[model samples]
Target: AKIGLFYGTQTGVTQTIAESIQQEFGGESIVDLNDIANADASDLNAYDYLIIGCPTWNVGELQSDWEGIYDDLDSVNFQGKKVAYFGAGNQVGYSDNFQDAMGILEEKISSLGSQTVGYWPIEGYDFNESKAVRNNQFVGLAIDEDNQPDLTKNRIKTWVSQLKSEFGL
Candidate 1:
């Protein structure tokens, strides 16, 4: 299936993770990587599956690029779309709001009827709170590049494998 991988980055960590995800999907042919700065509703609608990434800025704010396209999401009809989310956050620095942008993005599409996949367990993280938590787990993959960079690779690998199964691919 065609997959769209979109990301918003400030320090490029998010983009680097996006590249890893693209590689996990066997490169650009199967998964098209996009910078949310240039994305629109139709770009999102064109894919059979979507993997969206964002980084939480200071105190629960979305990365600038995602903030730019945040409102545009309202125009998209996600009735039958399946979405997965990933985010880069400083879990230690922002204990109260780690990966909040992921939750924000998920909530936006969920209201548009997107079927979200890839719920991740919260056991490995040590955050105090997060908007991304649902049913005692994260709404999506949470990468603490600043605090737990060592785990990022394995986490991505595991999440991609889980997504493949969830997406039936």
Candidate 2:
């Protein structure tokens, strides 16, 4: 069984997170969108686990790079496959939306027949590499480099390990 990690990023943050996920999950291979050859709806069917990561723009909008891959998923059928999703955004406390885009691709795929693993939630976010998710309210100032919510990388790895153990795969 193979795990597929597909990521859509605006500032490359998601890509780093996604690649780290590949290493953490022990994925045999992590293919890039451009590097995928002979790929289409049929080609994706071979993967056992699919993890799609995307970032939200347009105040909770999907990133542009994902447009083609997103559309390709439309006509495919993923009956018994397992899928997961991750997303990133600048939780600036000004947008009225932060991490609203996290895990949305999973929702989309779920609607089209894939099984998603969890619920999306907001919580305290901080890392040595960056900042925290703030809302010093309907009034405030940024306390860090960027306000990241859930920071789904390590979280996703934790979930995948659990799921794989459950499947005995």
Candidate 3:
């Protein structure tokens, strides 16, 4: 089964992280958004695993490109699909809304019946609050390169391995 990684970037952070994710997954078994933005909604059905990443902006708003295509997700059903979400945010600057955009997408896809996986622990983070947190865990890997740049690689490695384990990749 193929994996689909879709992402929207503002300052290129999300794209960098998305690239790391593809590298972790061996880069060959993945499909990207930029190459398929004009694709048919039904074409999304081809991937068994779907991973989406976005960056929080304007104190909790979804990134521009994602905001535009969000409604388009309704045209593609994710029933029985394995889905995971990741996002970038500034925990120090946007403490109250850290990664909230990720939560929004998580809800959007879950509403379409995606079996969301890759919930990440909330400990060791400095944020005051985040909509991305549910049951005391993040919807997926939450990276904060602005405040914790050194931790990005290890965090991505850990989260990618966890996804491999959970998704049987």
Deviation from native of the Cα of residue 54 in model 2, angstroms: 0.5
Q: Which candidate has the highest TM-score of all?
A: 1
lDDT of 2 by residue, 1-169 (tens): 3666666667777766666666665655443332122346555677766666666667656677665566787777888877655566665642555544443455557678876643333334422211112233111011112553344544656555665653345
In the range 1-169, model 3's lDDT, one tens digit per residue, is 3788878888899989988988987776544543224445566688878888989999999998888777788988799899999999999999999999999999988999889999999996988989899999999999999999999999999999899886786
Give one digit per residue, the lDDT tens place, for model 1 in 1-169: 3898889999999999999999987887878999998877678888869999999997999999899888888888889989999999998889999899999899888999999999999999998989999999998999988999999999999999999987777
Model 3, global lDDT = 0.86
RMSD values, in order shown: 0.9, 7.6, 1.8
Deviation (Å) of 142 in candidate 3: 0.4
| Consecutive 10-residue window with the lowest summed lDDT within model 1 | 39-48
By TM-score: ranked, best first: 1, 3, 2
TM-score of each: 0.97, 0.67, 0.93
Q: Which is the better candidate, 1 or 2, if ranked by TM-score?
A: 1
Report the number of the highest-lDDT candidate. 1
Off by over 4 Å in 3: 30-40
**Better structure of 1 and 3 per lDDT:** 1
